[PDB]
Design a protein around this ligand. Structure first.
Ligand SMILES: COC(=O)c1cc(=O)[nH]c(=O)n1[C@@H]1O[C@H](COP(=O)(O)O)[C@@H](O)[C@H]1O
Ligand SMILES: COC(=O)c1cc(=O)[nH]c(=O)n1[C@@H]1O[C@H](COP(=O)(O)O)[C@@H](O)[C@H]1O
Lengths: 215, 215
């Protein structure tokens, strides 16, 4: 992705979301749009972003249901123009395969969320995360998400998925993660608040990119 | 809930969703609306259903993100008029507390999803489910979701949450669960396809209710 930086656009107002995305577009080629924006402004926001900004869109819907429902969610998500969807691994292999099937049908991609970045992830997810990743490999998943806040866990993930798989990582900035350290293991970092709540989002993005180019 | 039966309205077309819900409204007082319908027709469908049918609405959004994102999701969901939201316990206590905080702010309810009903739940969720339920109790959660497909697990859940907590249960019909057995432990059953794919949804709902009244 351009500059190895993905914007997490979690503002919940279309006008503000368009403004910030437009201001930082020169520094990214990929925007992650989640439920905060979609449930506030509608699924049509995905196609609007893709057209206006010409950026790839990852639908961060943390998909976590039974297989039949996951199918429906993916179909709706790709019909709305998303390039990829983020799917939880914790519900198990059938739930993940359902998403992979729809992606194969519609020519898109699944990202498997393996271990989450917040403190509560330590309770249940972390203990399963290596296995979730190994399940991903066994299902042929090639794209993964793991936590900037725990680079030792992000290293272990990379170890499981191999060098060829694509790994993106949230928790940089607001949650405490560091861009450079995270990029030792991830291919790209996801950044939301450190950019979209900044007084000058373009300056914040540029500052991050400048510390990235130094790698 | 009326007749202890909650309709899972996972049709993805507003016209079909309105037709089936209207046909079965005499037999229910509560409709669960999930992402299949919302991502297809928009969040405004929640208020439309609540007004047209006068039914309570549970937003089944299987909320499974970090605390700050979960907050945003709940706020948007209640702003759209939902009476309650379904939240995953697997992301841990902070993610769940974030949802409880918004519910307390806005005068609504959280249902905690503890163990899922599909085969893949056996891989990771089942091994954590007792703890997830105990975490719920410790956070003051009063409403829970557990699996019709495993009544022995549904019994163990009930055992943890106590007699006073409210427990609803999907996986009845299509997934193999039985109404009467599930209602030995759950307060209400969730039913989707067995009703909404039936040639006569009113007849299917009535058939279920008739086997329920016999308890
Ligand atoms: C489930 O979706 C994610 O991509 C996600 C997983 C995770 O473990 N941590 C995490 O922060 N995210 C998302 O990534 C974004 C992080 O944004 P932030 O930089 O903290 O403001 C935000 O959209 C989160 O919901
Ligand atoms: C996460 O949301 C749920 O309520 C859910 C959890 C679960 O473990 N099993 C489960 O079936 N559900 C939902 O309940 C509905 C079941 O519908 P069905 O009767 O199988 O057609 C459908 O909306 C599922 O997504």
């Amino acid at each position: 992705v351009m500059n190895r930086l993905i914007l997490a656009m979690d503002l919940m107002n279309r006008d503000d979301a368009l403004r910030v995305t437009g201001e930082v577009r020169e520094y990214i080629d990929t925007v992650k749009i989640g439920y905060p924006l979609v449930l506030s402004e509608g699924m049509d926001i995905i196609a609007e972003f893709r057209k206006r900004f010409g950026c790839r869109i990852i639908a961060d819907f943390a998909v976590a249901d039974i297989p039949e429902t996951n199918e429906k969610i993916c179909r709706a998500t790709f019909k709305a123009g998303a390039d990829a969807i983020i799917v939880h691994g914790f519900p198990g292999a059938d739930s993940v395969r359902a998403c992979l099937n729809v992606a194969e049908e519609m020519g898109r991609e699944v990202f498997l969320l393996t271990e989450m970045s917040h403190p509560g992830a330590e309770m249940f997810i972390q203990g399963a995360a290596d296995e979730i990743a190994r399940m991903g490999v066994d299902l042929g998943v090639k794209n993964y998400v793991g936590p900037s806040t725990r680079p030792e866990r992000l290293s272990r993930l990379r170890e499981i998925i191999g060098q060829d798989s694509f790994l993106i990582s949230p928790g940089v900035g607001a949650q405490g993660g560091d861009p450079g350290e995270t990029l030792r293991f991830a291919d790209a970092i996801i950044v939301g608040r450190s950019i979209y709540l900044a007084d000058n989002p373009a300056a914040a993005a540029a500052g991050i990119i400048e510390s990235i180019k130094d790698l």
